[PDB]
Design a protein around this ligand. Structure first.
Ligand SMILES: C[S@@+](CC[C@H](N)C(=O)[O-])C[C@H]1O[C@@H](n2cnc3c(N)ncnc32)[C@H](O)[C@@H]1O
Ligand SMILES: [Zn+2]
Ligand SMILES: [Zn+2]
Ligand SMILES: [Zn+2]
Length: 423
């Protein structure tokens, strides 16, 4: 039986609340997506279905846009790819925005598919759209998406009759804007985008009592604090490495609300996040736009070159607790891991440890994975005691955030065995 229930909140629409007392690490819900797709940067880098990277992917012979890691994945993806195939083919070489491909998959799923388990607590139809809060600029954006969708879908959908009854394309894209989940791989690289409508019941907190993790497109919702009966369940919608100003802008632009939490009222941590010379971190913040774009396209060599010019600059440097500096170190570490530059990766990774401890309090899956990456680097270098403390710390965090149902935990147990036996 469910440990969570939908309820109507006083001032933030519908939410989820505990039906029984919950402890850290308690599995609360598991969901596949109602619909999902690979993101623009990872298209052709990860399998369309299982979202795992591979040096060589096979492509769908009809559209040559969908790509897969194996015959099995291509075959199993076919029912949900079949109708989009003709639309993807007939629009080459124009590839649609991610949201447009995602909505295509929603419409086909709702038209041809059995009722989805993802919609057990809340369906696509119930999703919040924030229509009466959208700015004129946002509305103009949505109208362009509607027309893009109508074009993309021409081959399969000619009119309302082939859409679910009373389906409003404008309102559907509005739901997508505030309800899309970014799907991350085991290394916490963004690889996909999906709708998980039951999970969409979780309201936001900059200091949450729950967490979500992805294992391919499969999502796990876990408690990360003690939660009493009737208490609202919350997740953080946002990157932890953001100032209250940055959080304000995103919660406004994407989700149409103002956060009244304690952290927003007091600018909790903002001063520490922005230490170092303002001129310097402004330029770093600007450069990070290009760096993140490159990372999103798995361009590790170019990512590294740009990060090294900042980390080892001839001019003034930032403290590692500065969030822009911190992100640069994170990107540099990941580029080094993927390029096999393990010594350099470890230098960057170890410098991130204390700032991560500060910015990801309690149990957060991003800290757990970062700590696991550092311990794994230490283990490969044969620094067994330093490795063992980090692997154990990773396990303390990830047993709460990931749990036994996540395959990455089994990988970590192997690493602890390998390190413990060597000790
Ligand atoms: C993923 S949905 C969450 C469930 C939503 N309350 C509903 O009724 O369907 C995201 C939307 O919920 C509302 N919301 C989420 N967190 C909030 C918060 N902390 N304060 C006020 N509104 C919030 C905003 O309307 C936001 O766009
Ligand atoms: Zn696959
Ligand atoms: Zn195809
Ligand atoms: Zn807040």
């Amino acid at each position: 039986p469910l440990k969570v229930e939908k309820f109507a909140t006083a001032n933030r629409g519908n939410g989820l609340r505990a039906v029984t007392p919950l402890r850290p690490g308690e599995l609360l819900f598991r969901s596949d997506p109602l619909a999902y797709t690979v993101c623009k940067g990872s298209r052709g880098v990860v399998c369309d279905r299982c979202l795992l990277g591979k040096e060589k992917l096979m492509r769908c012979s009809q559209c040559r846009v969908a790509k897969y890691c194996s015959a099995k994945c291509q075959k199993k993806a076919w029912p949900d790819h079949k109708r989009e195939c003709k639309c993807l083919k007939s629009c080459k070489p124009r590839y649609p925005p991610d949201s447009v491909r995602l909505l295509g998959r929603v419409v086909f799923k709702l038209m041809d598919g059995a009722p989805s388990e993802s919609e057990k607590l809340y369906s696509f139809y119930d999703l919040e759209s924030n229509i009466n809060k959208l700015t004129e600029d946002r509305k103009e954006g949505l109208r362009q998406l509607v027309m893009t969708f109508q074009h993309f879908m021409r081959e399969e959908i000619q009119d309302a009759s082939q859409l679910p009854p009373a389906f409003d394309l404008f309102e559907a894209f509005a739901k997508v804007i505030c309800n899309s989940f970014t799907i991350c791989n085991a290394e916490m690289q963004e690889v996909g985008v999906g709708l998980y409508p039951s999970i969409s019941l979780l309201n936001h907190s900059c200091d949450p009592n729950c967490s979500i993790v992805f294992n391919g497109p499969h999502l796990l919702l876990r408690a990360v604090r003690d939660i009493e009966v009737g208490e609202e369940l919350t997740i953080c919608y946002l990157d932890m490495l953001m100032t209250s100003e940055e959080r304000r802008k995103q919660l406004r632009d994407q989700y149409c609300f103002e956060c009244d939490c304690f952290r927003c009222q007091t600018q909790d941590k903002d001063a520490d996040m922005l230490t170092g010379d303002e001129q310097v971190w402004k330029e770093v913040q600007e450069s990070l736009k290009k760096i993140e774009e490159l990372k999103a396209h798995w361009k590790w060599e170019q990512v590294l070159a740009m990060c090294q010019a900042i980390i080892s600059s001839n001019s003034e440097r930032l403290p590692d607790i500065n969030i822009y500096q911190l992100k640069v170190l994170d990107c540099a570490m990941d580029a080094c891991i993927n390029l096999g530059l393990l010594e350099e990766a470890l230098f960057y990774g170890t410098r991130t440890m204390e700032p991560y401890r500060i910015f990801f309090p309690g149990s957060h899956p991003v800290r757990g994975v970062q700590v696991m990456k550092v311990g794994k680097l230490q283990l490969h270098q044969g620094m067994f005691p330093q490795a063992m403390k980090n692997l154990r710390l990773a396990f303390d965090i990830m047993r709460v955030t990931h749990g036994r149902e996540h395959s990455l935990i089994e990988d970590l147990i192997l690493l602890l065995e390998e390190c413990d036996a060597n000790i």
